[PDB]
């Protein structure tokens, strides 16, 4: 049973010092991985040659290449694998908006008709070609020889518009970017929520699944659960959107953080998943491989770096102990 911490840096800048401090806590407590969620609607938060984010000076928009590589090395030195999390096709407004500036011709050819935040996953060649360039860069940057044959990448797949009604396009798109990952010897991962019973039969079985919340179909019916992923030979990680999602904010006191700990102490188990009918449903299938606490950044706008650590370090310690 692996344990990970997931940090959203797309929504919130963490300095290299803060991130190494977090890695220290992970290390001190026996964690296995740090998932770095760096591409979302608000920003693409690491250096990128493809996107023109080439500054080698620290800044407040993105980690430099040297900072990032340093973070990965620091983690690997403590036997902690770093998992890139780049979100496709949706949650893409950060990098798409860069493409709109950098090459507006190409932008028109890759963006969905009605969602500025979504790449055209509808059988669009130029869109896949563009995404693959960006993925190639990521898979290279995140290369970790100390974990060859164990590397994973999160490719997104959450909250994808049109996916219920165009599931065939969606699954074909995810399978295509999974090939890219697999060609570099990475295991591809995606969130659970946009895969429907119609789509699962066709999803590449190399995928493992980050299970945050059981979906409801358009029509009202309950969608895939962990047992359904089991039946399709798909491994699952518990990312329970109640017990394992936390949003740091200056609106919290330390006593509020203790109540969060107290809550997580009874709500969290590695195999208690967020089902429609039961928020902390214990599932005992053999395809559960671990769990992650996730720190989303939407509410962290003017938290100081110290304040980030004040909230996060206690929650990391507790989670990695339970």
Residue numbers in the entry: 3 to 324
Published text:
One key enzyme class is the poly-β-1,6-linked N-acetyl-d-glucosamine (PNAG)-degrading glycoside hydrolases, of which the canonical member is dispersin B (DspB) from CAZy family GH20. DispTs3, DispTs2 and DispLp all consist of a single domain with the expected (β/α)8 (TIM)-barrel fold for GH20 catalytic domains. The β-strands in the centre form a tunnel atop of which the active site is located in a groove, presumably to allow long chains of PNAG to bind. GH20 enzymes use a substrate-assisted catalytic mechanism, also referred to as neighbouring-group participation (NGP), in which the reaction proceeds via the formation and subsequent breakdown of a neutral oxazoline intermediate.
A clade containing DispLp, which has 30% sequence identity to DspB along with potential dispersins from two other species, is separate from members of a second clade containing DispSf (26% sequence identity to DspB), DispTs3 (26% sequence identity to DspB) and DispTs and DispTs2 (26% and 28% sequence identity to DspB, respectively). Since DispTs3 and DispTs2 have the highest sequence identity, as expected they have a small r.m.s.d. of 0.63 Å. On the opposite side of the protein to β3, β4 and β5 is an α-helix, α7 (Lys246–Met255), in DspB and DispLp; however, this region is present as two short β-strands in DispTs3 and DispTs2. Interestingly, in the structure of unliganded DispTs3 an acetic acid solute molecule was present in a similar position to the N-acetyl group of the GlcNAc. The acetic acid also formed hydrogen bonds to Asp160 and Tyr247 with distances of 2.55 and 2.75 Å, respectively. A second tryptophan, Trp193 in DispTs3 (Trp193 in DispTs2 and Trp188 in DispLp) is present at the base of the N-acetyl group. A third tryptophan, Trp214 in DispTs3 (Trp214 in DispTs2 and Trp209 in DispLp) forms the side hydrophobic pocket in which the N-acetyl group is situated; mutation of the corresponding DspB residue, W237A, completely abolished all detectable activity on pNP-GlcNAc, suggesting that the hydrophobic pocket is essential to capture the substrate. An intense monosaccharide peak (≥5%), perhaps inferring a preferentially exo-acting enzyme, is seen for DispTs3, DispTs, DispLp and DispSf.
